[PDB]
């Protein structure tokens, strides 16, 4: 019943002369923006991309982000020189936030480096994590001392996001709760035997991602049985693979059950051998 | 360079007022410093500036900036013998110490009797 | 401008033979720069540092070399001396001030004539 606002950072350091900064916005499983190194602006992949902020507000954004992305470049370069790190570097940033409730809201403003956490930003200010090297304390000194940035980050987390992703939420409304019914069909996998068989039951074009699948012998569930990972369609729907290695022969009277929310508790049975 | 200050050089009598100009292109911009250099020493602090403010003051020496025109001038009030120097223009890129100073190439006042 | 020291005011050696010049400072700021300026011309940064064992190279050219083993010590060497190091060597430190600005703190400079 939540809708965070995820916005992703991607950026890659080969040597001190080649670069690449690209974004994207995620409000929960929707991707709501795309932002690519060699684009002027940040872009809007559903009409909804912009909520209720006007025109002017999201200029305003569009300026801030295009700021941003070329000075965290030249800081990043100069923060390899002065920490003596060597080249590839590979940094990511993940922030935003989730209007709860009533009133509250959470945001976050994570940085990875190399594929883990250094720091974040904590309520006004830089921090580094726990477990992160000592080089990183130089870098939150002097990230520390730059006054506007730390302000305006709070702006954006404390003021902007909570604004635009109520915006959103409003604007995407239909296509939020938005259901699209699942389709599954069973196949034989590679045999992992003799005598065992692989039975795999397919279950794609369901929306939202939430589901459930697994094979069963009547109202018994086959501890065993193991799903895959929920991968992405290109139309934004989902897929899934859920697998069984049984011996023979029997069973023989198994059954792949799906439960999905499209699709009224009226789950889709399928029963081997239907396929 | 980035930062560009006129005239190169000028020369006014005592007692009067002049002003020196100064015009950036760098961004993005964080503040902006002007330095009184008399030959054979140090620049010695005028005035620093943020974007958020169009003066400052410090004695005769009153510092304006126009953020929208990347402009600032220093306006000399009642001009004496010993503010003879070189007049130095310098803007930030960062409001921390990792960023770059922008020097400008200096205007040389002389202030005759 | 009270705060940061430059030994010696004025300096004269013969050509070939090795120059340090003593650059430091009371207070604890880590960024701290070399200038070199010609009489008449412009500040033109030769070396700078972000600490200890940090010794970045500046915008101008140069043969002298830098060394920061200490927080509050910035020595400029030039390993032999030749007649077109005459010039003057300001020092420089960053920290902050008055308000939650950075800003520079200018040494009183070292004037070099390297002789034959």
């Known amino acids: 019943r939540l809708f965070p606002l995820r916005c992703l950072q991607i950026s890659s350091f080969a040597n001190s002369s080649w670069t690449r900064t690209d974004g994207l916005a995620w409000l929960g499983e929707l991707q709501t923006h795309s932002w690519s190194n060699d684009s002027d602006t940040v872009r809007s992949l559903k009409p909804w991309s912009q909520g209720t902020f006007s025109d002017q507000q999201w200029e305003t954004l569009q300026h801030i982000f295009r700021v941003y992305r070329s000075s965290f470049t030249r800081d990043v370069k100069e923060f390899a020189k002065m920490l003596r790190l060597s080249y590839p570097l590979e940094l990511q940033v993940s922030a935003g936030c989730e209007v709860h409730p009533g009133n509250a809201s959470n945001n976050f403003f994570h940085v990875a480096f190399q594929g883990k956490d250094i720091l974040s930003f904590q309520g006004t200010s830089w921090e580094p994590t726990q477990e992160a090297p000592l080089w990183v304390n130089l870098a939150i000194q002097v990230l520390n001392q730059d006054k506007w940035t730390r302000e305006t980050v709070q702006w954006l987390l404390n003021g902007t996001c909570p604004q635009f992703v109520s915006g959103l939420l409003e604007s995407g409304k239909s296509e939020l709760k938005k259901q699209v019914k699942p389709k599954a069909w069973l196949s034989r996998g590679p045999s992992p035997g003799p005598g065992r068989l692989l039975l795999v039951c397919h279950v794609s074009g369901f929306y939202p991602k939430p589901v459930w699948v697994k094979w069963m012998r009547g109202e018994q569930e086959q501890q065993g049985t193991q799903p895959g990972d929920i991968l992405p369609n290109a139309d934004e729907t989902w897929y899934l693979r859920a697998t069984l290695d049984v011996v023979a022969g029997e069973a023989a009277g198994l059954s792949c059950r799906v439960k999905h929310s499209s699709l009224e508790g009226q789950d889709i049975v399928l029963y081997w051998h239907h396929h | 360079n980035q930062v560009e200050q006129s005239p190169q050089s000028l020369i006014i009598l005592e007692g009067k007022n002049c002003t020196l100009q100064?015009?950036?292109?760098?961004?993005?911009?964080?503040?902006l410093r002007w330095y009184k250099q008399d030959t054979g020493r140090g620049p010695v602090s005028l005035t620093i500036?943020?974007?958020?403010?169009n003066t400052k003051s410090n004695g005769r020496y009153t510092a304006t900036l126009d953020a929208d025109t990347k402009q600032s001038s220093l306006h000399i009030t009642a001009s004496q013998l010993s503010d003879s120097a070189s007049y130095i223009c310098?803007?930030?890129?960062?409001?921390?110490?990792?960023?770059?100073?922008?020097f400008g190439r200096g205007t040389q006042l002389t202030v005759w009797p | 401008e009270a705060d940061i020291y430059q030994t010696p005011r004025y300096l004269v050696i013969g050509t070939g033979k090795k120059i340090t010049l003593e650059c430091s400072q009371t207070?604890?700021?880590?960024?701290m720069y070399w200038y070199q300026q010609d009489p008449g011309m412009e500040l033109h940064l030769i070396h700078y540092?972000?600490?200890?064992?940090?010794?970045e190279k500046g915008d101008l050219s140069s043969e002298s070399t830098v060394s920061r083993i200490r927080t509050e010590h910035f020595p400029l060497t030039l390993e032999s001396a030749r007649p077109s190091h005459t010039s003057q060597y300001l020092c420089?430190?960053?920290?902050?001030?008055?308000?939650?600005?950075?800003?520079?703190?200018f040494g009183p400079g070292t004037r070099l004539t390297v002789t034959e």
């Open positions: 420089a430190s960053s920290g902050l001030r008055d308000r939650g600005l950075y800003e520079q703190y």
């Open positions: 100064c015009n950036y292109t760098v961004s993005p911009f964080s503040n």
């Open positions: 500036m943020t974007f958020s403010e």
């Open positions: 310098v803007v930030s890129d960062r409001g921390s110490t990792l960023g770059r100073l922008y």
């Open positions: 207070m604890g700021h880590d960024k």
């Open positions: 540092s972000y600490g200890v064992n940090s010794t």
